[PDB]
Ligand binder design. Sequence first.
Ligand SMILES: [Cl-]
Ligand SMILES: [Cl-]
Ligand SMILES: [Cl-]
Ligand SMILES: [Cl-]
Ligand SMILES: [Cs+]
Ligand SMILES: [Cs+]
Ligand SMILES: [Cs+]
Ligand SMILES: [Cs+]
Ligand SMILES: [Cs+]
Ligand SMILES: [Cs+]
Ligand SMILES: [Cs+]
Ligand SMILES: [Cs+]
Ligand SMILES: [Cs+]
Ligand SMILES: [Cs+]
Ligand SMILES: [Cs+]
Ligand SMILES: [Cs+]
Ligand SMILES: [Mn+2]
Ligand SMILES: [Mn+2]
Ligand SMILES: [Mn+2]
Ligand SMILES: [Mn+2]
Ligand SMILES: [Mn+2]
Ligand SMILES: [Mn+2]
Ligand SMILES: [Mn+2]
Ligand SMILES: [Mn+2]
Ligand SMILES: [Mn+2]
Ligand SMILES: [Mn+2]
Ligand SMILES: [Mn+2]
Ligand SMILES: [Mn+2]
Ligand SMILES: [Mn+2]
Lengths: 104, 106, 99, 99, 79, 87, 99, 99
Amino acid sequence: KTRSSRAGLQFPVGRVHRLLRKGNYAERVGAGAPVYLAAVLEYLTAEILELAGNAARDNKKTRIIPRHLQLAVRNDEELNKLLGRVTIAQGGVLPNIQSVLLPK
Amino acid sequence: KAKTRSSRAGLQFPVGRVHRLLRKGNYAERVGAGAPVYLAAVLEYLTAEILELAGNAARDNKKTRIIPRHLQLAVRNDEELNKLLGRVTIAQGGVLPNIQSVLLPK
Amino acid sequence: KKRRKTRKESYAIYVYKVLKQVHPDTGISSKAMSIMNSFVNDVFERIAGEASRLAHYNKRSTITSREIQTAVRLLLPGELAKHAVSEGTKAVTKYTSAK
Amino acid sequence: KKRRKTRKESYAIYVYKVLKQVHPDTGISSKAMSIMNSFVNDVFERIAGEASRLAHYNKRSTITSREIQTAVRLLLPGELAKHAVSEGTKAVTKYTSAK
Amino acid sequence: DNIQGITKPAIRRLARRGGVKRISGLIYEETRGVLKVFLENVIRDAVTYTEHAKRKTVTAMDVVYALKRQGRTLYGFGG
Amino acid sequence: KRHRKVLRDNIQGITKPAIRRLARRGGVKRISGLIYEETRGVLKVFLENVIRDAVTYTEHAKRKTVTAMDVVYALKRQGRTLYGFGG
Amino acid sequence: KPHRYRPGTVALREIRRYQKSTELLIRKLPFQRLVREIAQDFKTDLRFQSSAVMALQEASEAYLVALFEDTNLCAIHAKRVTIMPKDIQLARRIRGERA
Amino acid sequence: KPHRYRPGTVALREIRRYQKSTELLIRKLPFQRLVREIAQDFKTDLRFQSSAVMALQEASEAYLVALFEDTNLCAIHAKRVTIMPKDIQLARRIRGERA
DNA sequence: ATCAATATCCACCTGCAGATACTACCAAAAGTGTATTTGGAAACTGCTCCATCAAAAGGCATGTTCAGCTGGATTCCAGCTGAACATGCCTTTTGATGGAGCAGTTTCCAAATACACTTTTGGTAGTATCTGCAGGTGGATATTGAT
DNA sequence: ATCAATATCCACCTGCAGATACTACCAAAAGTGTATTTGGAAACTGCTCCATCAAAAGGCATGTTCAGCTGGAATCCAGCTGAACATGCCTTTTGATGGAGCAGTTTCCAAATACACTTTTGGTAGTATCTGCAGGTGGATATTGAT
Ligand SMILES: [Cl-]
Ligand SMILES: [Cl-]
Ligand SMILES: [Cl-]
Ligand SMILES: [Cl-]
Ligand SMILES: [Cs+]
Ligand SMILES: [Cs+]
Ligand SMILES: [Cs+]
Ligand SMILES: [Cs+]
Ligand SMILES: [Cs+]
Ligand SMILES: [Cs+]
Ligand SMILES: [Cs+]
Ligand SMILES: [Cs+]
Ligand SMILES: [Cs+]
Ligand SMILES: [Cs+]
Ligand SMILES: [Cs+]
Ligand SMILES: [Cs+]
Ligand SMILES: [Mn+2]
Ligand SMILES: [Mn+2]
Ligand SMILES: [Mn+2]
Ligand SMILES: [Mn+2]
Ligand SMILES: [Mn+2]
Ligand SMILES: [Mn+2]
Ligand SMILES: [Mn+2]
Ligand SMILES: [Mn+2]
Ligand SMILES: [Mn+2]
Ligand SMILES: [Mn+2]
Ligand SMILES: [Mn+2]
Ligand SMILES: [Mn+2]
Ligand SMILES: [Mn+2]
């Protein structure tokens, strides 16, 4: 029986634990640390996949490409801050023209 | 204790301490013998460089004891040091005197 | 097997699981999967990093889930933080309630 | 007398030594010395941090002087970097050739 | 008062150190808003360090660490 | 039997139409004539900085090939973290 | 006539005066008040080391002064000498504080 | 007689076009030679994984586009619609790339 | 041009915060000597992928002509913002006193590490067959701009 | 408000790249089970420094007046810059090559950790003496702004 199932998770608790030792973040790693972290990662993954899938859907597509990931992130105030210094390859930008540039 | 590793390396900065600080740092599983020597040297040098300029700045202002203002003028007047400490704030440093020319009389 | 290329692990199968959970009929391009993978590693490091620092700041040689938690509060914005904390605590509680 | 002692070490004495070598008739305020201490700490952390990543990227469990060197190259402005490497190699030689 | 305690002449002094010659009437209100947001952002993080360390006092290190991670490193309080 | 023709003046390969296109994505409607030379300059600096670090990684690794991770680590440490190319 | 200085003459004199000094420019207590009130929103019954308050004041003033520089630069960009809210707003948006 | 769109109409058409797509806008090969030229001036006999060349271009266009936005914000600040070098310069000064 | 009102400057003086210097005391820190462990350089080489060349073709760059409309200049004045002066309200300072709580200390156990097997799994590899959509077409509708 | 040139739309289609499906294999990962070790929570508390007064002392902020001078509106025009056109080049794409260099493997030892034992030293604390320069003086002269 895995620790992931034991903690009710999709994300690998064993791996996360391993990578935490390997990474040299502290002398010791408590058993609850990789669990909590697998949890958070799985949650954020879920959040962005919900929103990206929606944008995929809004554009009549069934396969999420990076455009959708970008759309999802930049259209969401919080993920946009979390990734305010991250560039998503092949993402383009949000349609957006400044007002004074339109005619009348 | 025979000879301090700092004096073996010809340095004022504490090689031994720098070494200990590296291990407890959780920077790598291990630490070579040359590394604390090298780094201690590197900190020492940079320290000299700042005190040097900052010293000069004390002179310029008719003074013999360095205050923060002096370290601030030292750093901001030096292209490279200013880049290195470009996201750093020196407390009680004030700013360099600089007025934009279009604000100058007539 | 060609002098067996040493294994390159990623989060893909787990992202994929989670994907079927939220949008059961949606696929994901391998470039988009690549972004997702970078996404997860990036955030892993940021949280582990903050934790690493927290423990150090407090002369603690162990990173517990309490470090992971503050790390999450320090790093993520408002609502993502609240939910992340929530899902994390829950999952730990479940984990320890076993046995 | 060992109770409320909990040692608070700083680079301050070693800063002061270096001061006299370059400006033997120049002194330094408390606040100023404190800035200098923050300075050495900051730079220690930057260099050490970068040297750490370097080692991890290259799957190495040991931070050597080579890592400190590349770290410096990556971190210090050209000319400041050049002299730093020079000072660095020097002290590592002087040390090897010593007793 | 409070935020309103950060007075017009004080805001004027800062501006001056920043090289400013002529100041629009609306600046003082705008400025206070900005300063509020700065402090909120910093204090939150600082306090969160306080809570972690199980204390009821915000220490200078609490602030320093928070500044550092706001990308606003401060020298001279690392004692 | 071994080539490498001299590489020079390749900055001019950042053509005026390509720079215009970029300004468009950037939301720009009207472009002064002096922009193109200016933009070439700004890109040149950007590349130099990224490659310098990228190559420092390659070298430290005793390799002769600049890998995408090199560029990735280089980008990260300049606060231009990039997703999509590994790591 | 009694004696009056042209508008802008004293302002210049103040810029020159304040770029020369380093003393903090906000009254200490109104500031301490402000700090405490904001904090109370995050946790109640808080005490502040006095050095912690000073850190915060040092940091804010540095921040505001530097912001006024960029602000001044935006006003000059539009052929003015009078800083306006749109100038602060632009500077901040370009800093990534609003983007 | 021949039809003529008014000045600005194609520009807007183009902004819409490009904001809608994600493909790169600098021709691949010219870009590569630039990268290769610049790298060579740092070190000779270097080679490049093609993905490393692409990593650079994706990063570079991402940077330049974002810059133009800031620039466009500056021109509009000056009450213009035409971006000029002084706009790029103001932008880069505030970003802390210049001064 | 004058000349007056202020600011600003330099020399000198002196009190005192804060730096200096002496002495004692001690843990924790640093060196040194001995026993053992292993990270990762060297050597050899399998196998990926980078440089390079070839040849074909058309997408897109270059260069030009032309005039539309933007930027840049000039003028203008209404009003908002600086300067100054008069109050007086609260920040500052200070010296002094409880007492919150941070920090040092001893205790001890729940949880972490070490380790030895044992089982499970994700990654790759190979080979073979689906499926979302880019990009091509053609024809209907929407936007623009000249009257 | 009409008409016509052109962009834009969308529905339709089809190759096909990329995504997917199966089998097969296994080295590393992960779990399980003990033995052995200890990080830091807990609880008691001592003393540092924080909150709170009191209490002038006055400094500095606030309110008001008045007018200079700046911001922004309106007007003009020269020429820069966008749109369209013609021509054709060099990027792109498709495919094939040797071979440089990265990356996998096994060998093996210079240098690391791991402990212990001795010696040192940087920090703290207690007491005492010393001094760089802030802040106050006065008197020269420079700046600014009115004639
Ligand atoms: Cl834990
Ligand atoms: Cl070493
Ligand atoms: Cl405004
Ligand atoms: Cl310009
Ligand atoms: Cs790390
Ligand atoms: Cs946060
Ligand atoms: Cs550098
Ligand atoms: Cs004078
Ligand atoms: Cs005095
Ligand atoms: Cs051409
Ligand atoms: Cs033409
Ligand atoms: Cs249409
Ligand atoms: Cs097709
Ligand atoms: Cs206290
Ligand atoms: Cs051509
Ligand atoms: Cs071409
Ligand atoms: Mn060259
Ligand atoms: Mn080994
Ligand atoms: Mn004309
Ligand atoms: Mn105009
Ligand atoms: Mn008037
Ligand atoms: Mn108590
Ligand atoms: Mn499996
Ligand atoms: Mn299509
Ligand atoms: Mn213990
Ligand atoms: Mn004007
Ligand atoms: Mn070879
Ligand atoms: Mn001593
Ligand atoms: Mn003085």
